[PDB]
Amino acid sequence: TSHCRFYENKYPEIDDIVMVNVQQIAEMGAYVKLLEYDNIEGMILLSELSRRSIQK
Amino acid sequence: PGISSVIPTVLEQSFDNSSLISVKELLLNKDLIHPSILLLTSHLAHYKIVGSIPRCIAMLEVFQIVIKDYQTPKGTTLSRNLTSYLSHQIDLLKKARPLSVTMGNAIRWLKQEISLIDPSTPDKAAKKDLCEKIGQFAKEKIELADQLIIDNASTQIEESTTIVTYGSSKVLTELLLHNAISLKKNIKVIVVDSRPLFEGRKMAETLRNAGVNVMYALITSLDTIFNDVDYVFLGAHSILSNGFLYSRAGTAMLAMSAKRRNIPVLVCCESLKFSQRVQLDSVTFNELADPNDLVNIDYENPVERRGNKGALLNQFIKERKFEKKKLAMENKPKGNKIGGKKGSEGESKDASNEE
Amino acid sequence: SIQAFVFCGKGSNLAPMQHSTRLPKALLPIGNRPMIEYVLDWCDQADFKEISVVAPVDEIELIESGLTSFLNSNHSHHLQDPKKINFISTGESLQKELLPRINGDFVILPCDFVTDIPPQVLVDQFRNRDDNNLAMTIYYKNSLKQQQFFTVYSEILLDVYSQRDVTKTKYLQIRSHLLWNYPNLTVSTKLLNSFIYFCSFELCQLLKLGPQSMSRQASFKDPFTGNQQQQNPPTTIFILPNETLFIRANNLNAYMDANRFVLKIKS
Amino acid sequence: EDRLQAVVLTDSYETRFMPLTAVKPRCLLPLANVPLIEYTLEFLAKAGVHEVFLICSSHANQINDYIENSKWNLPWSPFKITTIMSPEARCTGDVMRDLDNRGIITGDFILVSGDVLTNIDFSKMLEFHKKMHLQDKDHISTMCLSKASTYPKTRTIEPAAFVLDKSTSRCIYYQDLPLPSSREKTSIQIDPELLDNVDEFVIRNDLIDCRIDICTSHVPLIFQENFDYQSLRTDFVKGVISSDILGKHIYAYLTDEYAVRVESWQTYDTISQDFLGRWCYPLVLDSNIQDDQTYSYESRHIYKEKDVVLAQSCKIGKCTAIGSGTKIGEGTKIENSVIGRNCQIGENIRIKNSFIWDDCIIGNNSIIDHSLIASNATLGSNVRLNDGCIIGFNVKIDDNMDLDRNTKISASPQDLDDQTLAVSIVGDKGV
């Protein structure tokens, strides 16, 4: 079984960076599992994700 | 260049909008042509399986292969003769058999890509990222789009459904497979097939190879099976900017029948299949093949039989012409599932501006 | 991608011409036109660029000279002489030797040929129908005893059994597993093999590891058997040989057929 | 060509159909509500026979009665039926010898072995036979051949091998092999005497057995001469070929049309399936040959006779048949099954590739998957069957029973499992 935090704590802090692997999209945004801090789901709304073909 | 002109069969008084014939047997070819293109041409000339969707993918693959095999010369730059080569390839393809809108779009994209990367970057590094980009594109506008289509179908299709299909569109086959194995539903798949092409037959065979209850249908016996039928999907090729489906064989008749008898018609389509070019009848731009396919008695494709048929110029004026692609109407197909999720056929080119 | 290998040896089966020190098997005047002329014409027709001719221990430069002088050629022909030839070994030992030079698909065509058939349609068939091996059979002379047997299929056109009447048991024997899979097996008596061979990409692996072939017939088309036990490693498309029939008068030379060929040529 | 006589071999492959044949015979049994001999009779009529010879031995009285009841004893027909008496379980040679001893034949005669349902026009064949005879004096019999269904992989019982000719068409060798059921033999030997006289050879294994012969006035004499022969296909033709009489030849004929003989259960099932589909063109139930039958073709491959009672809310499948006077309740999920004339049905039967013969009473709740129910056998409550199950004559299946694959049920009221009386393999009772 694969679980547990990567650095020190389960919950991320402020201004820190995290990498996410996306499973499913288009409902609210992307509420997917993390690879930098534990396996608990992290969410983005459909506005902060876009910087500049949005679905593809 | 190869071979040009000198072909059997008359020009015909009725229907002469497009040129009817082209190379089939290889004799005296240029010593620069990539064999994969030639092989593809050979295939297309006498193909039974592919239709619109897989063809484009194949073409893309071929292009990728060519790119992989291509290296920048010492004298001429990366953008010097590549475009010319592409043009030549296009010309060859056209000579072989008329092409689709998807292919054109792909060509356009390739051209754009050519312009984008400036001839200054390292050559090895250039093609490394190019092939990756192209792969990504393929994943996006085809496979991902297919997935999207499947998902759209999922929410709309009810529990235990009867589906009536035509042609050999890969997407529809994929959908049917999904319905069979992954979701596990009760499916009754009625497939209709014509004389010169055994696409429906092939589809049926594929279904059997999975384990689905299939009814084989024909143009001569249509009304007997409808009078029971709830949902009808058509083999899509291209949607025009009027609201008309330029599709393969007797789908229009089926659509008409559907319109007459209760239920509306549904069409599944890709986001890149859309065309800005406009036409409103079958007479406008017709896709033609040799009348040699309809000479023999049916059963199987290769037979070689002695009977009665086998005269085109020998007998007193005999014309045996047929059409491969026809026009489907506007008001009859309402459903359209694309890369932009939802929309109707009345919404002709709303997705074209959005891209 | 495209290449051809031309087999050359020495006349051992022929009775009367070949035993001379200066006259080779490749260069022979039979009916005005030379023996390797026809082959060269065929090759030209086939649009093959790089053709490499394999030579025996005897005649090292004569063949080269022939290639150069007298004849249209206009192609980069290379004549190579491997060492491991004993004859008691026709061409299989040459084939085994030359394998890294092969980049794609190779065609085997011996020096001795009398040809009249269309050449493109064999090649096209080889290309299209998705098959590893293809061979040709032609009718016996119709112009006014124990011979040879070959298997044919009629619809796809396949080859299964090819063994001759030289060394076998008195009663003809057929296998059960070789009959149940592919049910129809037509056996002809009149047909003669012209020794035209076509090879795909995946053939180079087997020759370097395990040699069993004799006269390019024993372990070449017959070990296609995926039946009963399956104890030989295959290269992947399933291993299947093919055969095609032709009407025109064009055959092999081995016995007293040279004199008949002379009669034929003048028409 | 006018005035022809035919000999039909009926009751020959008994005990091969092991669960049946105890009171009622083999040939009298129906394919789909209508007997197997009827088709043969029809074929004979089509051909133009004026004298019919029929052989009966086991359960012969019933056969005779059936013949009497059939519309051929009456003088309107060009042909009349005469029965040949013989002891129980015999070879085909003895019967032939007996026939020869009796002596009736003048000219050409037709010898049909087994039960054959065929749709081929035979006048042309006859003409061909005549032409070939006119070629040379020493010629005997004609053989029929047809192209096999797809590949012989489901057909394991019939491994018929043929060596043929293109120019004159002549048979040489016959061989049989098991293979997927038992892997043992790998050797077949061929005769090396005659090769260059024929030149052309076409060896074929994918051919359906028919066992039909059009014969000249030589065969009975031959049989009299050499009394070592037992069967016509296995020993006789081969013997004739291998220099029995010098100069005598035999015929082979090829037709693409449907012609399959019955010998095993799976084969029978396949034949039934074919019949259900539109493979047979002259032999369809909607035409009604027997005149008493009132069948009509309907949509979704469903066969129906006049006056059928069926309750509300039911779902139907593909390739089905329903006989007349059937009283059916709520439930029936019918897929790929033939149901006989006059059948009372309680409630709910799940049907997948099943088979039901004439006059059957089914009770309440049964899940049936690929099995056959014989005539006058009644089904009670809770019946569940697996693939390839055969139920015999007059079997009274009571309450609560479960059976698996290849379970055979007896017909006699002797050697096999499940008895005809009360409860089958839950309480052993009977003789």
Swiss-Prot record, chain A:
Coiled coil: none annotated. It comes from the Eukaryota. It is found in: Cytoplasm, Cytosol. The modification Phosphoserine is found at residue 50. Phosphorylated; phosphorylation on Ser-50 by the GCN2 protein kinase occurs in response to low amino acid, carbon, or purine availability. Phosphorylation inhibits the guanine nucleotide exchange factor activity of the eIF2B complex. Belongs to the eIF-2-alpha family. eIF-2 functions in the early steps of protein synthesis by forming a ternary complex with GTP and initiator tRNA. This complex binds to a 40S ribosomal subunit, followed by mRNA binding to form a 43S pre-initiation complex. Junction of the 60S ribosomal subunit to form the 80S initiation complex is preceded by hydrolysis of the GTP bound to eIF-2 and release of an eIF-2-GDP binary complex. In order for eIF-2 to recycle and catalyze another round of initiation, the GDP bound to eIF-2 must exchange with GTP by way of a reaction catalyzed by eIF2B. Present with 17100 molecules/cell in log phase SD medium. Eukaryotic translation initiation factor 2 eIF2 is a heterotrimeric complex composed of an alpha, a beta and a gamma subunit. The factors eIF-1, eIF-2, eIF-3, TIF5/eIF-5 and methionyl-tRNAi form a multifactor complex (MFC) that may bind to the 40S ribosome. Interacts with CDC123; the interaction is direct. Interacts with GCD1. The chain holds residues 3 to 61 of 304 of the full protein.
UniProtKB/Swiss-Prot annotation, chain B:
Disulfide bonds: none annotated. Keywords: Acetylation, Cytoplasm, Initiation factor, Phosphoprotein, Protein biosynthesis, Repressor, Translation regulation. Acts as a component of the translation initiation factor 2B (eIF2B) complex, which catalyzes the exchange of GDP for GTP on the eukaryotic initiation factor 2 (eIF2) complex gamma subunit. Its guanine nucleotide exchange factor activity is repressed when bound to eIF2 complex phosphorylated on the alpha subunit, thereby limiting the amount of methionyl-initiator methionine tRNA available to the ribosome and consequently global translation is repressed. It comes from Saccharomyces cerevisiae (strain ATCC 204508 / S288c). The chain holds residues 237 to 593 of 651 of the full protein. Its main location: cytoplasm. GO terms for cellular component: cytosol; eukaryotic translation initiation factor 2B complex; guanyl-nucleotide exchange factor complex. This is Translation initiation factor eIF2B subunit delta. Present with 10300 molecules/cell in log phase SD medium. Belongs to the eIF-2B alpha/beta/delta subunits family. It is found in: Cytoplasm, Cytosol. Residues 328-355 are annotated as: Disordered. Residues 342-352 have a biased composition (Basic and acidic residues). One of its GO terms (biological process) is cytoplasmic translational initiation. One of its GO terms (molecular function) is enzyme regulator activity.
UniProtKB/Swiss-Prot annotation, chain C:
The modification Phosphoserine is found at residues 215, 219. The modification Phosphothreonine is found at residue 225. It is found in: Cytoplasm, Cytosol. Signal peptide: none annotated. Belongs to the eIF-2B gamma/epsilon subunits family. Acts as a component of the translation initiation factor 2B (eIF2B) complex, which catalyzes the exchange of GDP for GTP on the eukaryotic initiation factor 2 (eIF2) complex gamma subunit. Its guanine nucleotide exchange factor activity is repressed when bound to eIF2 complex phosphorylated on the alpha subunit, thereby limiting the amount of methionyl-initiator methionine tRNA available to the ribosome and consequently global translation is repressed. Component of the translation initiation factor 2B (eIF2B) complex which is a heterodecamer of two sets of five different subunits: alpha, beta, gamma, delta and epsilon. Subunits alpha, beta and delta comprise a regulatory subcomplex and subunits epsilon and gamma comprise a catalytic subcomplex. Within the complex, the hexameric regulatory complex resides at the center, with the two heterodimeric catalytic subcomplexes bound on opposite sides. Present with 9530 molecules/cell in log phase SD medium. This is Translation initiation factor eIF2B subunit gamma. It comes from Saccharomyces cerevisiae (strain ATCC 204508 / S288c). The lineage of its organism: Eukaryota, Fungi, Dikarya, Ascomycota, Saccharomycotina.
From Swiss-Prot, chain D:
GO terms for biological process: cytoplasmic translational initiation; regulation of translational initiation. It is found in: Cytoplasm, Cytosol. GO terms for molecular function: guanyl-nucleotide exchange factor activity; translation initiation factor activity; translation initiation factor binding. Signal peptide: none annotated. The keyword Repeat does not apply. Keywords: Cytoplasm, Initiation factor, Phosphoprotein, Protein biosynthesis, Translation regulation. GO terms for cellular component: cytoplasm; cytosol; eukaryotic translation initiation factor 2B complex; guanyl-nucleotide exchange factor complex. It comes from the Eukaryota. Its main location: cytoplasm. Component of the translation initiation factor 2B (eIF2B) complex which is a heterodecamer of two sets of five different subunits: alpha, beta, gamma, delta and epsilon. Subunits alpha, beta and delta comprise a regulatory subcomplex and subunits epsilon and gamma comprise a catalytic subcomplex. Within the complex, the hexameric regulatory complex resides at the center, with the two heterodimeric catalytic subcomplexes bound on opposite sides. Belongs to the eIF-2B gamma/epsilon subunits family. Present with 33800 molecules/cell in log phase SD medium. This is Translation initiation factor eIF2B subunit epsilon. It comes from Saccharomyces cerevisiae (strain ATCC 204508 / S288c). The gene is GCD6. The chain holds residues 24 to 472 of 712 of the full protein.
